[PDB]
Design a binder for this molecule. Structure first.
Ligand SMILES: [Mg+2]
Ligand SMILES: [Mg+2]
Ligand SMILES: [Mg+2]
Ligand SMILES: [Mg+2]
Ligand SMILES: [Mg+2]
Ligand SMILES: [Mg+2]
Ligand SMILES: [Mg+2]
Ligand SMILES: [Mg+2]
Ligand SMILES: [Mg+2]
Ligand SMILES: [Mg+2]
Ligand SMILES: [Mg+2]
Ligand SMILES: [Mg+2]
Ligand SMILES: [Mg+2]
Ligand SMILES: [Mg+2]
Ligand SMILES: [Mg+2]
Ligand SMILES: [Mg+2]
Ligand SMILES: [Mg+2]
Ligand SMILES: [Mg+2]
Ligand SMILES: [Mg+2]
Ligand SMILES: [Mg+2]
Lengths: 160, 102, 63, 209, 169
RNA sequence: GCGUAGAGCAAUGGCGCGGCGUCCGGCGCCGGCGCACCCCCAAACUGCGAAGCGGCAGGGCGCGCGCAGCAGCGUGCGCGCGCACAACUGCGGGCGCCUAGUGGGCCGCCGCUGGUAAGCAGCGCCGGCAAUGAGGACACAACCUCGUGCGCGGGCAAGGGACCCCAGCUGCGCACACAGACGAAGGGCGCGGGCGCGCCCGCCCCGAAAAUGGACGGUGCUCAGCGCAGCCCCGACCCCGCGCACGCACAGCGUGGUAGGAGGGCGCGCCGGCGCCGCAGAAGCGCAUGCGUGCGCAUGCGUGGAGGCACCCGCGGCGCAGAUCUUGGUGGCAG
């Protein structure tokens, strides 16, 4: 029932944090961007031009296009029973380079290096799967210098 | 099986020969029984019971003792009874009611 | 007469019967690309294994 | 002409104060929130008794005035007009509405401001009396004359705190002897080692004892 | 019900190799309630939640009833009603510790409708006759106490029998 | 990424008293104002901020060479060589075409909005009814259990186990009010426990008044009430096992169904054929028997008195319980 302007209901979404107002720092201009790189759209409300829709303010998408001042981003949206790919054009002030695949890239470049080096020496490594947290280990807790302490239920008293 | 179990009992009584407390490594699997019926299940809980292959009540499976599987068992813990089978419960479940998916 | 205005009831159940289908994979499109970049990429594809100086030595002024 | 208080008993709505959006609400009849000897110093009334709500409900401003007069008349007639300071804790900030409907019925149902209520919680003090220790039984009796005016269950508690400060009577007595308290009338400030030392010595200059 | 002494601690990590061992004496129906009552006390006395607790030992504290006399037991408990949470001290005479708390549970249920899960036991102490504070349990500590049975009890299961047949005696 | 619950008065906006003052006014006091503490606060307040959710990632990489009008020293794109299968669990998946019905909903849970409230009105999420039988709820669209072919055997669920009515015994308490069996503020030297005469906890009592005679479902029950423990039992189409039917891509798995769609058959008038039957009795009809999940089919006997059947094909005015259906006949009413 609410009105359907382009920034509807963005009182908190398109605000600035406490003691973090102001125009963006020039250090954002030294960020590289490449096609295929994932980015997080998070709107800088001090920058009024090139602002994406409020729908994409939490979303993360892959860059398909790179412009003079802006970036094209592929972001899927649910339209009923389907994901529809939207092309989001955003200024670079409204995006951050995403750390979504940050630990995957760190894992991949090391593991691909280790597979290359093992193939160089004629060996091979079978599987470098991430092992999840299994069962608990067996423990040994000695009572040497660690005496067991009784926990008791205590009588209910109230302070007033 | 007897040698593995005897080694843990010998590890446990030697620890209480000293002051220590020894609990072994907890088993590599849970045994899970579907308790509640198939009705009125929310879509997350209905999905987890599908991935545990528990599609009717009084059905039992083994799930791995993983950290992701423990979180799956926790979210449907109002629908299942789960715990730790020893080797006697493992072998009784498979030899008495054990079929193959071929 | 006055009746129900709106509900989203049964909509998530409807939308998951045939599932939430993904974006259907396609050939890569030049829709949305930078025009100066796309113009230059096609020039690199046009003169891919033969250089431009060798291409215009054959076909004359290619513009 | 006033509706019964069972119509506006419970905290049904979101809190709805007098604001720029809700104007035209009349003034509450609860006019006074501090009775007895208000100007009495912090160290004159050690005892503190509280009327505490055992309900989540809305106390009417009319009941807040009626329990005010019932408790104030009893403390005057029995403890005397100088031997107490009774503070009304809750303030009637929530505005209740009346539809009042030719008879429109439920069309355009949002009501006009009808009255003011105070919204209380479980364990929230409604009234509080600070007295000398001799008038414990008087102050317990004046509060049970106040809770007759109130809906639901209330409980009279004798608090171990010293008067209207949060500090307990044993802990207040120690810091009063240490010189660590500066009075603010009904409440008090505890002198800490956090200031500049020239300001700390001015703080000990203005202490209680 | 049974008595359990359940030993547990924080799960040892590389930062804390030997955590402090705790134990709780629980009167519970089984070990799963006993683990549950242990996990709340580690959650509320300390801040160790149950995901980071290893339960080191669970033992059944069972008394030897070799000659089976009746002892006196003074039970300090904390029970939660529908209205609040209160302290009570009840005295019972019984066989064992695990039977005396069964007398506590049936009495708090009969007299106060306190369910078994609404009751936390502060302490259970076996007492002398001289230290008993309830005069009702003191009467049966006297030697040579005697009373008759006034309730009629049947000597079989009957539906209908003739009038001459003794059924009570 | 969020800004809800909570929390906070620190900014915005309110609330309220004291305290302080080389502040102002009036006559030390009173009132203003200022400051500091504090108080009550906020759907349209926020220095904080959960539970909970949302997005994305968990696979291709490395190297080399070509190309560009882009760029000014990169970025893309071609091509080659080499490396290589990436948490857990489950499991076949993707896409297209045509078309129906639907577009009055309702209910429960949790979260809400309006309203004195409503079996009221309006939302969110999930589940249900609608279209979901069966068991338990005395009966009872939605509650609980739980799904559902046709049977047999077992075991149970919810719920129960005085008699109706399948199934109960052993112990420990408590209560007396035509109570249990709708209820408030406020009460009770009523009884049972507990704490320091006052409190607290259970049960009971008073407050407690409606109109056909009457409803813990009934009988009734004062150990059939209110509590507990132990062992046991009863109880669904659930679960298990077996057998059969049907469907499936068929060492097996599956089985509810309105609107709706689809498939395969049954039946009717006639057609092109093809096998036949009939005055030693055809169709039709009546009563039987049999077959068949079912649509229906076949026979026997009786009647009937001249046609008919089966199958394959083809055409269709092709199947009735309803339409205040149409037409005809006949009842009850009613001697
Ligand atoms: Mg502009
Ligand atoms: Mg009236
Ligand atoms: Mg409301
Ligand atoms: Mg808020
Ligand atoms: Mg809040
Ligand atoms: Mg309605
Ligand atoms: Mg059902
Ligand atoms: Mg039913
Ligand atoms: Mg029924
Ligand atoms: Mg049985
Ligand atoms: Mg019977
Ligand atoms: Mg079945
Ligand atoms: Mg069917
Ligand atoms: Mg149909
Ligand atoms: Mg024919
Ligand atoms: Mg035929
Ligand atoms: Mg016709
Ligand atoms: Mg007809
Ligand atoms: Mg019909
Ligand atoms: Mg007639």
């Amino acid at each position: 029932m609410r009105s359907n302007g382009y920034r509807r209901g963005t009182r908190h979404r398109f605000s600035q944090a406490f003691r973090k107002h102001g125009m963006p720092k020039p250090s954002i201009l030294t960020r590289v961007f490449k096609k295929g790189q994932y980015v997080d759209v998070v709107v800088n409300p001090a920058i009024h031009k090139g602002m994406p829709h409020k729908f994409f303010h939490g979303r993360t998408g892959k860059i398909f296009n790179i412009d003079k001042r802006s970036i094209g981003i592929l972001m899927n949206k649910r339209c009923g029973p389907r994901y529809v790919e939207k092309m989001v054009i955003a200024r670079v002030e409204h995006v951050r380079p995403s750390r979504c695949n940050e630990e995957y890239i760190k894992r991949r470049t090391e593991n691909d290096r280790l597979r290359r080096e093992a193939a160089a020496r004629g060996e091979k490594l079978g599987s470098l799967k991430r092992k999840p947290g299994g069962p608990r280990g067996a423990v040994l807790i000695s009572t040497e210098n660690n005496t067991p302490i009784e926990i008791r239920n205590e009588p209910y008293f109230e302070v007033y | 099986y007897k040698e593995h179990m005897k080694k843990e009992e010998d590890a446990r009584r030697e620890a209480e020969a000293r002051g220590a407390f020894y609990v072994p490594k907890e088993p590599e699997f849970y045994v899970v029984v579907r308790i509640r019926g198939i009705h009125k299940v929310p879509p997350r809980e209905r999905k987890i019971l599908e991935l545990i292959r528990l599609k009717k009540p009084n059905h039992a499976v083994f799930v791995r003792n993983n950290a992701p599987m423990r979180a799956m068992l926790h979210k449907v813990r109002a629908y299942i009874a789960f715990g730790f089978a020893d080797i006697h419960l493992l072998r009784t479940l498979v030899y008495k009611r054990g079929m193959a998916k071929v | 007469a006055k009746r129900k205005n709106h509900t989203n009831h049964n909509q998530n159940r409807k939308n998951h019967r045939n599932g939430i289908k993904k974006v259907k994979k396609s050939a890569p499109s030049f829709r949305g690309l930078n025009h100066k970049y796309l113009r230059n990429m096609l020039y690199s594809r046009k003169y891919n294994n033969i250089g431009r100086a060798a291409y215009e030595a054959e076909h004359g002024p290619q513009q | 002409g006033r509706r019964p208080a069972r119509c506006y008993r419970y905290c049904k709505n979101k809190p709805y104060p007098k604001s720029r959006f809700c104007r035209g609400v009349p003034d509450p009849k609860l006019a006074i929130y501090d009775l007895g000897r208000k100007r009495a110093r912090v160290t004159e009334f050690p005892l503190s008794v509280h009327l505490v709500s055992n309900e989540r409900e809305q106390l009417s401003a009319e009941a807040l005035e009626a329990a005010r007069i019932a408790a104030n008349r009893y403390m005057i007639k029995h403890a005397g007009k100088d031997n107490f300071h009774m503070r009304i804790r809750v303030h009637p900030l929530h505005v209740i509405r009346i539809n009042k409907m030719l008879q429109t019925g439920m069309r355009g149902s949002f009501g006009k401001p009808y009255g003011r209520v105070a919204r209380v919680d479980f364990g929230q003090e409604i009234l509080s009396i600070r007295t000398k220790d001799a008038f414990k039984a008087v102050a317990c009796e004046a509060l049970r004359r106040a809770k007759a005016k109130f809906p639901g269950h209330q409980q009279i508690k004798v608090s171990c705190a010293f008067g209207f400060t949060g500090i307990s009577r044993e802990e207040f007595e120690r810091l009063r002897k240490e010189g660590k308290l500066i009075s603010q009338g009904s409440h008090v400030t505890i002198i800490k080692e956090k200031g500049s030392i020239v300001g700390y010595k001015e703080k000990l200059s203005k202490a209680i004892q | 019900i049974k008595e359990y002494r359940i030993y547990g601690s924080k799960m040892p990590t590389e930062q804390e190799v030997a955590p402090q061992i705790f134990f709780h004496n629980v009167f519970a129906k089984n070990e799963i309630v006993a683990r549950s009552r242990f996990n709340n006390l580690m959650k509320t006395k300390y801040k160790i939640k149950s995901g980071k607790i290893v339960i080191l030992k669970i033992e059944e504290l069972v008394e030897d009833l070799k000659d089976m006399k009746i002892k006196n037991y003074g039970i300090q408990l904390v029970y939660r009603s529908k209205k609040g949470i209160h302290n009570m001290y009840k005295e019972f005479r019984s066989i064992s510790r695990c039977k005396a708390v069964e007398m506590l549970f049936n009495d708090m249920a009969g007299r106060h409708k306190a369910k078994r899960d609404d009751i936390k036991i502060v302490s259970l102490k076996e007492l002398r006759s001289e230290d008993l504070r309830r005069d009702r349990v003191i009467q049966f500590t006297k030697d040579d106490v005697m009373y008759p049975v006034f309730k009629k009890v049947l000597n079989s299961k009957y539906d209908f029998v003739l009038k001459g047949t003794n059924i009570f005696n």
